């Protein structure tokens, strides 16, 4: 089997991606999050605290035919970011752009953190990390990819983020229309249950290409591209007025800049992300400050190959019994 589903970016700054996905019988639809930095499908539902539900499309399992409580489960998961949200488990039938899971593990939110809530626009996550990370206790649970592996014709899904555009997500098969030139494949470790493997280096700009290895996670929920502070000051050294403010959280620039593209390298490839890529917009309507897509890792602890970066490719989350990834231009 095969799916393919359209991710259309929820905002015009592409902050994130939502993809239409439907869970129980009937159908309901709702337009989920999905994200390869995590291991959890969860939905805002009709069980989520009501004054934490402010426009999001809502799962209500006792209207699915289908839908089974997981019995004494719960789930309970933190981000990056900061945010949070908890509750406890159903099985129902989900389908992904044609391709269905039957038993898929739907984790309903019983609470969401505020930043979840003033999303109207994300109605929950699907997780496309490992399954080893998933929250569900005492019974862990296996992410859609996982639970759809061995039905599909080949066991991958890829990821082909628009720049203010619509996407692509596919299971199943690698569309050879989709990108120019080769699919270059580099080692993936498993072991902190991420899509975790080493670019070969960067460039800024029309500079000289620097090898270097970078450790980084593929992840399709941080909207950012997160490198070390050497990198991310190389980089925006390159722009005049650029600076890393405290009170904003990060590096800023002057919104009259045109910003320098930034290289990175997968084996002996090389991924281009344009300077338009990297532009956040203002720091609050009307300034002519500009918030920068490149911000540094420092203090997260893990170096991120989030939107910013992936949308500059087609990618391939090859889940083969030695998991690989593969980047491509576009």
């Not at 309970?76 to 129902?92: F, N, P, Q, R």
């Not at 002057?254 to 910003?259: D, F, Y």
């Amino acid at each position: 089997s095969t799916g393919s589903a359209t991710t259309t970016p929820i905002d015009s700054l592409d902050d994130a991606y939502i993809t239409p996905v439907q869970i129980g019988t009937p159908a309901q639809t709702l337009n989920l999050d999905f994200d390869t930095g995590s291991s959890d499908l969860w939905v805002f539902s009709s069980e989520t605290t009501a004054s934490e539900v402010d426009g999001q499309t809502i799962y209500t399992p006792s209207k699915s035919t289908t839908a089974k409580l997981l019995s004494g489960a719960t789930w309970s998961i933190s981000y990056g970011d900061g945010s949070s949200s908890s509750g406890d488990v159903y099985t129902d039938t989900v389908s992904v752009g044609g391709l269905t899971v039957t038993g898929q593990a739907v984790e309903s939110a019983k609470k969401v953190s505020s930043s979840f809530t003033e999303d109207s626009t994300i109605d929950g996550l699907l997780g496309l990390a490992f399954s080893t990370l998933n929250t569900v206790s005492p019974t862990q649970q296996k992410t859609f990819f996982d639970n759809a592996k061995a039905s599909l014709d080949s066991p991958v899904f890829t990821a082909d983020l628009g720049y203010h555009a619509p996407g692509t997500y596919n299971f199943g098969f690698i569309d050879t229309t989709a990108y120019t030139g080769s699919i270059t494949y580099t080692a993936v470790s498993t072991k902190q249950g991420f899509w975790e493997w080493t670019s070969t280096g960067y460039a800024v700009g029309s500079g000289t290409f620097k090898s270097t290895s970078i450790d980084g996670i593929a992840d399709t929920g941080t909207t950012l591209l997160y490198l070390p502070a050497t990198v991310v000051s190389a980089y925006w050294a390159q722009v005049s007025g650029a600076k890393s403010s405290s009170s904003v959280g990060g590096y800023v620039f002057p919104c009259s800049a045109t910003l320098p593209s930034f290289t990175f390298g997968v084996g002996s490839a090389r991924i281009v992300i344009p300077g338009d890529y990297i532009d956040f917009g203002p720091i609050s309507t009307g300034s002519s400050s500009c918030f920068g897509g490149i911000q540094s890792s420092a203090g997260i602890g893990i170096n991120i190959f989030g939107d910013v970066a992936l949308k500059a490719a087609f990618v391939v989350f090859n889940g083969a019994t030695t998991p690989t990834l593969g980047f491509a231009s576009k």
